[PDB]
């Protein structure tokens, strides 16, 4: 009844090139199995979504990646609230949603679009730049740390660690085990930036710490919660602004819109994030036998969701695989769907959205002028390098 197949979709082979991989996942019908490891795959819209949205059958608390806590030691202490199922998610999620707030963005946002069109000014100055180091990385480094409260040093360490939480979700493959193998210095750095003290006044971090007074979360859930927005915050925008700036550096007509009427910036972005879905895959575990279409899931089995896949459906997108700046974006699953989907949306697509303005307002042309690199991770998508000749407008 469920078809079995051979794709690893944590295979280099796949990174460098998933789409035909993808439509086979597709078609070969709504659940397929995953002989390689051992987990049931749905790659269409429609089973994402269902899954996504029943917690109860398709559980967090067993983990979100590969392992299953139930069988093996977590890397590190849980997450409280990606790894958390309800009712025990609920206040640690109604806090990150108080301290990532509109409020919030409001209290940001002008620094952020300063912050912005400076980077897009200064990387005008220069012309020739790689579009990942210099502006994808560059750009989030500049706001999101400070807006953490962190301290300078140390800050190295931010993407390293990333790279790991992202790379841990995976399978035990080699990008697995040799991100754990280096993991000791970005763990130690990070735990320790998520102590109340090393917080400055005003930030996310002091902010959460400081919501350890209503009934919500205690003292000793704080540091956790930190930690959740420093595994996060930061790489998955690098790829995110990263896969807007290569969507439009190859659909020039695209970014010629976007020039045309700057106010499409957030939907450019919110499109970008559907396009090249920079959080690939989540996993979920039933906690019972479930039908789902059409096949029988025993319990305590894992499942793999495609979120890029269910992004380029065709079953759900007219032209799927065309980068559309006016497209309508809602309902992708690019952020997730249901109790879990992102709660840092709001910082993603603040910064998202700016950048995008600072560039459809301030340049003419982004043309690849080098060697483009895929960067290589269990979970996330996107580039290594990206360089690009920026023209003035
Ligand atoms: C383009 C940028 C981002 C993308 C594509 C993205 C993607 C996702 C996805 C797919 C999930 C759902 C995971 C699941 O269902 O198991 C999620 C959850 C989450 N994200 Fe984001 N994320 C982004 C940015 C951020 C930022 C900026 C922050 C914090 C500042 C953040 C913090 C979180 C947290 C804490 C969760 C857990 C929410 C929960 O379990 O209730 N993310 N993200
Ligand atoms: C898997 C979606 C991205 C993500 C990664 C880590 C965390 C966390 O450490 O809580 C939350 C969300
Ligand atoms: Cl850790």
Redesign the pocket.
Known sequence: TIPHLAIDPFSLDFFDDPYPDQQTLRDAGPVVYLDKWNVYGVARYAEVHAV?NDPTTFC?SRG?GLSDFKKEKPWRPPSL??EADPPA?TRP?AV?SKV?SPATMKTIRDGFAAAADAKVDELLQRGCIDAIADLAEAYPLSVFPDAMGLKQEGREHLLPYAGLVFNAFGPPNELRQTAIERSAPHQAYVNEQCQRPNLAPGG?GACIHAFTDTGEITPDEAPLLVR??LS??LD??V??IGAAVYCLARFPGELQRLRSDPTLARNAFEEA?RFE???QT?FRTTTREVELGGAVIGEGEKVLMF?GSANRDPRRWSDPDLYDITRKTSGH????SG???????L??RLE?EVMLSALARKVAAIDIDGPVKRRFNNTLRGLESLPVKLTPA
Do not use: E
């Open positions: 996504l967090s979100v609230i990606l998610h999620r990150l990532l996310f959740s927005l996060a915050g998955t925008t790829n995110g994030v879905s920079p959080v989540v979120l699953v690019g952020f997730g109790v879990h989907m992102c709660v840092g949306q910082v993603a998202g």
